[PDB]
């Protein structure tokens, strides 16, 4: 029933969260050099507008943080991961997020918290970028063009933003292409690999800790209402050094939707949702912080406001 803007908490009148000119008053960045721009973009003490300005200039220059054939990876040692939500903690999540429309069944599918054995793996520090996805398209001849590319056209000023929306099978295809190109075991992360990389062995509610922080991720509460250059919300980095797990774009995993086994809570929608879509995790610039919860499971519907991107894992 809601318009896109209503769903994003915005009025019908115009709202801006960025300057009219991103580098106005930040002209010292022109002489900084790319290594200095990278430090500024990833420094949590720098105001967002200056990090955004640095990231935007890197987007024009060619961002050296994005190396398509040797992407920045973080190693994660084998572990007994705890995945999902304790049924006794559902009430707290609902009180926390009912204001934005969350209802009990959406959170109940995170139950029960359970153990998953993970072998050692690596995960991309950043989500896959527009520039990376373009190289994939040009090498493969794929017709899997991103929905946000107007008329299928590459948005060059946003070279270092995450790509969206693509299908889960296009994300799969990107991973197979890079695996073949590099000889490395690239793939999408499993749902358990994604959640553990965000939450750690401490099972944090968010990548950054126990309480939502609108400055730690690009979400709709206070984000700029578009994607951002990867990695310019450093306060939201996970314990393993992964950036943008909360916010920016939702991220596909390898798993199609399934109920977690052992959950005595009746899900009357399972008769149509089981195996019906690929799980997406992490939330996005258009949605609220409930989606930046490490345990939140999403992906059921295709909508303009659901920005679907991805990041790769690697078998070690």
Q: Which residues bind its own copies (CB under 8 A)?
A: 4-5, 8, 10, 12-16, 18-24, 27, 30-31, 53, 56-57, 59-63, 131, 134-135, 137-138, 141-143, 145, 148, 150-159, 224-226, 286, 304-305
Question: In the complex with its own copies, which residue's Cβ is closer, 18 or 273?
Answer: 18
CA 115 to CA 82: how far, in whole Å?
5
Among its own copies, Ca ion, none, partner that 297 touches (CB below 5 to 8 angstroms by kind) = none
Q: Of all helices (H) and strands (E), which one includes residue 97?
A: helix 90-97
Give the binding-site size for Ca ion (rule: CB under 5 A). Answer: 2
Using rule CB under 5 A, residue 146 touches Ca ion: no
Q: Residue 167, exposed/middle/buried by CB under 10 A (0-12, 13-18, 19+)?
A: middle
Q: How far is the CB of 210 from Ca ion (least distance, A)?
A: 19
Nearest of 301, 262, 286, 258 to residue 111 by alpha carbon: 262
Which residue has its beta carbon closest to Ca ion? 282
Question: In the complex with Ca ion, which residue's Cβ is closer, 159 or 218?
Answer: 218
Pairing of strands 313-315, 186-187: antiparallel
Q: Residue-wise over 37-60: b if at least 16 C-beta within 10 A, else e? A: bbebbbeeebebbbbbbbbbbbbe
Question: In the complex with its own copies, which residue's Cβ is closer, 14 or 99?
Answer: 14
Among its own copies, Ca ion, none, partner that 269 touches (CB below 5 to 8 angstroms by kind) = none
Using rule CB under 5 A, residue 248 touches Ca ion: yes
Q: How far is the CB of 286 from its own copies (least distance, A)?
A: 7
Q: Residue-wise over 168-198: b if at least 16 C-beta within 10 A, else e? A: bebbbbbbebbbeeeebebbbbbbbbbbbbb
The structure tokens listed for 236 are 């939201």
Question: In the complex with its own copies, which residue's Cβ is closer, 208 or 285?
Answer: 285
Among its own copies, Ca ion, none, partner that 225 touches (CB below 5 to 8 angstroms by kind) = its own copies
Report CA 271 to chain centroid distance, whole Å.
28
Q: How far is the CB of 96 from its own copies (least distance, A)?
A: 25
Among Ca ion, its own copies, none, partner that 282 touches (CB below 5 to 8 angstroms by kind) = Ca ion
Q: Measured between alpha carbons, how far apart are the two ends of the chain, in Å?
A: 46
**CB 252, CB 299: distance < 8 Å:** yes
Question: In the complex with Ca ion, which residue's Cβ is closer, 231 or 263?
Answer: 231
Interface ranges with Ca ion (CB under 5 A): 248, 282
């Amino acid at each position: 029933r809601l318009t896109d803007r209503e769903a994003m908490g915005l009025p019908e009148t115009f709202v801006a969260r960025t300057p009219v000119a991103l580098l106005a008053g930040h002209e010292d960045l022109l002489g900084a050099g790319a290594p200095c721009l990278v430090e500024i973009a990833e420094d949590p003490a720098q105001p967002f507008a200056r990090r955004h300005a640095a990231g935007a200039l890197l987007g024009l220059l060619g961002d050296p943080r994005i190396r398509p054939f040797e992407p920045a990876m973080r190693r994660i040692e084998a572990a007994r991961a705890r995945i999902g939500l304790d049924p006794a903690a559902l009430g707290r999540v609902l009180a926390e997020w009912e204001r934005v429309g969350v209802i009990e069944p959406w959170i109940a599918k995170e139950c029960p918290a359970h153990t998953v054995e993970l072998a050692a793996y690596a995960l991309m520090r950043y989500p896959v970028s527009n520039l990376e996805y373009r190289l994939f398209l040009e090498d493969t001849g794929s017709t899997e063009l991103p929905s946000s590319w107007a008329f299928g056209v590459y948005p060059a000023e946003r070279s270092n933003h995450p790509v969206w929306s693509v299908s889960a099978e296009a994300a799969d295809h990107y991973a197979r292409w890079l695996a073949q190109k590099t000889g490395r075991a690239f793939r999408l992360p499993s749902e358990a690999e994604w959640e553990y990389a965000a939450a750690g062995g401490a099972a944090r509610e968010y990548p950054w800790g126990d309480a939502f922080d609108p400055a730690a991720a690009n979400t709709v509460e206070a984000g700029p209402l578009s994607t951002t250059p990867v990695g310019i919300f450093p306060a939201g980095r996970s314990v393993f050094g992964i950036d943008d797990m909360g916010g920016n774009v939702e991220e596909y995993v390898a798993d199609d939707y399934r109920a977690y086994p052992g959950g005595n809570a009746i899900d009357d929608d399972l008769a149509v949702t089981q195996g019906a879509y690929r799980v997406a995790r992490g939330g996005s610039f258009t949605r609220f912080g409930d989606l930046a919860r490490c345990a939140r499971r999403h992906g059921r519907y295709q909508r303009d406001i659901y920005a679907m991107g991805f990041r790769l894992a690697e078998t070690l």
